[PDB]
Amino acid sequence: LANPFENEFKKASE
Amino acid sequence: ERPTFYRQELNKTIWEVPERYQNLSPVGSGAYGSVCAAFDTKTGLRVAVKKLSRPFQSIIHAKRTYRELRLLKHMKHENVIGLLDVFTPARSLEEFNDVYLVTHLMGADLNNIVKCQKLTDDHVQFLIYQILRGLKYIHSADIIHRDLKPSNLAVNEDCELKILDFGLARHTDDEMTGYVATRWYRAPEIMLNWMHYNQTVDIWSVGCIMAELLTGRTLFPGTDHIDQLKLILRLVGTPGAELLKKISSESARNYIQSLTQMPKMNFANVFIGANPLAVDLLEKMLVLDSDKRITAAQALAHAYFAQYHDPDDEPVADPYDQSFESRDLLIDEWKSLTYDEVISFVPPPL
Ligand SMILES: O=C1c2ccc(Nc3ccc(F)cc3F)cc2CCc2ccc(OC[C@H](O)CO)cc21
């Protein structure tokens, strides 16, 4: 199962 | 000996229940899920009947169904919802698809109380006390709840409180399911230390719930994960150098370091006119560093609860033994294990 938090963190920085 | 069942459509759902349960009536018009008030003619009790929603709809939900039934059968405590009955309309494992749970009718949840315009500090004391009393018991069984929130706390007319909904609860372990809790009540280490939180996430939720009781408003009503993290950091402050090093996500650390630096707020300046002892307990509950958070047992001894605290009336549990829950099973195995637990249930004496 995938980590939805890292996805949003990496995007927010990008 | 199977009782006679009858069937009734209630808010676009077919309920099939033993005849002993009469005059089924969805609480709050069906806004609180699949729970009906009923009258148990076998006992004369006013009961609440919960039809489990889609209990075997996936491996994960089948697993959760088994865990919740096992825990409910194991636990016995005044501040934890207790089973009067468990039944299924199915006549054999082969047609087993529905599970119903029965408990005493309570009549409200904490969401109602949050709106009560006559709420006093003594009421808050007594309600949070009971949450912590139940939580001390749960945690002493090595159970973790992982979804405390206002709608999961039932309150009766004597302001007696019971923790509801053990659907996300389990035996605690070093590695657990990553995406847990309801977002507004989700402890930050759930987002920062993926799958490696522990029982202190439940203390975070209790802190959020107490704040909501005191102010009438959701403490951290975030609209997404970034929003949620920032709402928390604005209150507890951005982590310092030593605390960043405990964050396991490099993307989270990087994001946090990009924010404006935030100090911990003085909670006395957030919760205006609240009991100073309530503010003090909140400061000990809502701390970013999981390891410095107060425990349920410690919190019961806090001076805020001096009216209610009795160290010999705050019992601990027999520890919960994880029978079959350590492996990945197919839905049909979870079903057979859950069927066996339904068929073996013994109701408590009246
Ligand atoms: O008493 C309530 C209750 C009881 C049980 C339960 N789950 C559960 C757990 C285990 C089990 F075995 C059986 C179960 F049903 C969930 C709730 C919801 C809290 C609530 C809110 C409002 C109510 O009536 C409001 C009036 O309708 C005016 O709107 C009644 C209840």
Author numbering:
A (entry chain B): 88 to 101
B (entry chain A): 4 to 353
Please quote the authors directly.
Activating transcription factor 2 (ATF2) is ubiquitously expressed in most cell types and regulates the transcription of various genes involved in a broad spectrum of cellular functions: cell growth, development and stress. Mitogen-activated protein kinases (MAPK) control transcription by phosphorylating TADs. In the present study, we explore the structural and mechanistic basis of ATF2 regulation by two MAPKs: JNK and p38. We showed that JNK and p38 bind to the ATF2 TAD through distinct regions.
To map the p38 binding region of ATF2, phosphorylation of different ATF2 TAD constructs by activated p38α (pp-p38) was tested. This analysis unexpectedly identified a critical short sequence (92-FENEF-96) C-terminal to the 69-TPTP-72 phosphoswitch. We also determined the crystal structure of the pp-p38:ATF2(83–102)_S90N complex. This structure revealed that the FENEF motif adopts an α-helix which is wedged in-between the N-terminal half of αG and one of the α-helices from the so-called MAPK insert (α2L14). The bulky hydrophobic side-chains of F92 and F96 are buried at the FRS pocket that forms only in pp-p38 when the activation loop is double-phosphorylated and W197 (located in the αEF/αF loop) is flipped out from its original position. This explains why ATF2 binding to p38 depends on the activation state of the kinase. Apart from direct contacts between pp-p38 and the SPFENEF motif, there are helix capping interactions that stabilize the α-helical conformation of α2L14, αG, and the ATF2 helix itself by involving glutamate (E93, E95) or the S/N90 side-chains. An asparagine at this position mediates stronger binding (by about 5-fold) compared to a serine, while phosphorylation at Ser90 abolishes binding. Phosphorylation at S90 is sterically detrimental. The MAPK FRS pockets are overall similar but residues corresponding to W197 of p38 are different in ERK2 (serine) and JNK1 (methionine), thus ERK2 or JNK1 cannot form the FRS pocket required for ATF2 SPFENEF motif binding.
